[model samples]
Target: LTSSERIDKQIRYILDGISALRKETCNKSNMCESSKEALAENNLNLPKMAEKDGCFQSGFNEETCLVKIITGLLEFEVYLEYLQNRFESSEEQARAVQMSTKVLIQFLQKKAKNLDAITTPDPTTNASLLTKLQAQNQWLQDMTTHLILRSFKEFLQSSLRALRQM
Candidate 1:
């Protein structure tokens, strides 16, 4: 798989972790009492429930608001947003990787259609308007494989680099 696909796969697993954690921690069973109550608050916190952050953005100061019955729900709110953003980024990368593969196929199709227009082919030979796909079978396949492989190492290098935490 390409790096983006691999990243998307790994991110899906991480998303499952966040999903479970969200399901567990953000429920009314863990909620605090309220001056302005949003009842069935756990229903508000469920997996299918979409939480809004703009309402809580102003409440982010130690001077303004704080936690009570749930020690981490607000924090989980932020974490959930983090997971959502991560999901989008990895999904976009995965899509781009897929698009690249389709483009390669299109290129090959064009090449196949014009394979015999001239006497010569191959970049290193008497070049023609087109080269036989059969002419560089091993080379093209090897390059395509290597190009796809570049995706994996990229995600690894970036993800692996951040080894420290607070």
Candidate 2:
């Protein structure tokens, strides 16, 4: 195949991968919401319910979901930008991939930190509510780390491979 043809194939693959990632993540978020509602019904905190339901609770922080979606979109946008750059020159594709990967890594790191904070216990407080909250947050963090983090990594790997092939 011609270099142009290869590039086109690579781009298509990357786009497909991005679409799959979005769908998966969105579904997970929906599950998270449902779990939250169930928790509310049982008079449990969002975090606690998430743990029980094997979902990421996110502690009533709407921004957690927004950030996840936004970051995923940004990753997709970066992939498209890389594809455009690839068409212009092979070197551009390499640079774009590197830059995009850096951004993704940073986003993941931030997410991990936030998740940890939500789940970790604070020794300064002795309230029963605080303990319950901590337990819930811990469960959410576990879900995010195990499920969400894995999905994000898979998406990033597929995107990077496509860029490399280009």
Candidate 3:
């Protein structure tokens, strides 16, 4: 596949994964308005790309965007694992999300053969993806997880638009 084809295909799976996880997170996990307020009140914030970032804005850097997408997906997978191991709940929904992430990671790794552009398992690879959660409470963990999903979805939406133009 051409670079654009590779990106477009990955976008489909990424959207499916995120949307499915979000449905389960909100419908099954019962995320509510108070959850959002709790996060806002505590100053918890999700990671964001820079305004001048080249990934999806100003110009489309396919390589940069691929790395960003992979990094974001991997970081999200880490959060899902944190929830599973720390709380021992949401095993089913978390597992579903994990499966999707794994697929995307592998799909990109195989299609994107550039060694330098590859991602890493080291936490330092995506350090800023998540600030350490201050508390072990489920509310914070779950809400943060949902926000991560939201961020990734938005990333894909804009990134897909750019890739389509190519």
Top-lDDT structure, candidate number: 3
Q: How many steric clashes does model 3 contain?
A: 0
The backbone clash count of each candidate, in order, is 2, 1, 0
Candidate 2, residues 38-142, lDDT tens digits: the string is 232122221211222212322333334323333443433333333333333244433444444444444433444333122223223324433343356644422
Give the higher-lDDT candidate: 1 or 3.
3
Q: What overall lDDT goes with each candidate model?
A: 0.28, 0.36, 0.56
Residue-wise C-alpha lDDT for candidate 3, range 62-125, written one tens digit per residue: 6666566566556556655544343234455555546655665666666656622345565673
Per-candidate RMSD vs. true structure? 25.3, 17.2, 4.7
Report the number of the highest-TM-score candidate.
3
Off by over 4 Å in 3: 1-7, 27-32, 35-47, 82-93, 115-117, 121-135, 162-166
- For model 3, the local distance difference test gives 0.56
Ranking of predictions according to TM-score: 3, 2, 1
Candidate 1 matches the true fold with a TM-score of 0.22
